[PDB]
């Protein structure tokens, strides 16, 4: 005799009895905060293959996150080394923590505005062409000539 109330896991198919298999676990996820607004970049654990900007699947390279950025988003980096040219999207921000090293050039695209950068050591030029103003750089170093 097996019950029908639905409070059951031992539904027996052909054969004498079912025993039990994968049961409906709750899957308590980790904390979520500013999920699609703020993004994380790291080298220790990030992996752009399936990165989302969340604390559990942070982007592994700067270039990856910036591409997926939306207006009003905030890109937050972590100490390490990163490579690749890029150009921040309009109405966005970039923030650094502790020592950070970048291997590439950074360009402010045509008609861009509202950008903000801080706490980065850029190992290359920093071109500013076609910009529309409203920019602000802080605590940054450049190994070559701004243009």
């Amino acid at each position: 005799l097996d019950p029908v109330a639905g409070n059951l896991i031992t539904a027996t198919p052909d054969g004498l009895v079912l025993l039990a298999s994968g049961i409906p676990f709750p899957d308590p996820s980790s904390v979520n905060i500013s999920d699609n607004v703020t993004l994380r970049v790291d080298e220790v654990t990030g992996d752009d293959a399936t990165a989302d900007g969340s604390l559990q699947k942070p982007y592994k390279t700067i270039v990856a996150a910036i591409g997926a950025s939306n207006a009003g988003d905030n890109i937050e980096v972590y100490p390490g080394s990163y490579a690749g040219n890029f150009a921040p999207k309009s109405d966005t921000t970039v923030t650094g923590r502790g020592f950070v090293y970048v291997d590439g050039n950074v360009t402010i695209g045509a008609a861009v505005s509202g950008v903000t950068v801080s706490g980065l050591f850029i190992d290359g030029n920093l071109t500013i062409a076609g910009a529309n103003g409203t920019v602000e750089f802080i605590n940054t170093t450049v190994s070559t000539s701004i243009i």
Binding site: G67, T107, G109, A110
Partner: protein
């Protein structure tokens, strides 16, 4: 057999012995423009459009 499976994982996808349409999936993704990677640098005058 190698010349088939080797092509299936052309897009970093696990082989699935429970499904008999794996090569189908790989072909579909090839045409999909929606899955292309978004760019992250300012376009140059010498970059082509398709």
């Amino acid at each position: 057999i190698s010349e088939i499976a080797n092509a299936i994982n052309a897009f970093g996808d696990l082989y699935d012995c429970s499904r008999l349409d794996n090569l189908k999936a790989a072909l579909q993704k090839a045409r999909s423009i929606c899955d292309l990677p978004p760019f992250a640098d300012a376009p140059d005058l010498d970059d082509r459009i398709a």
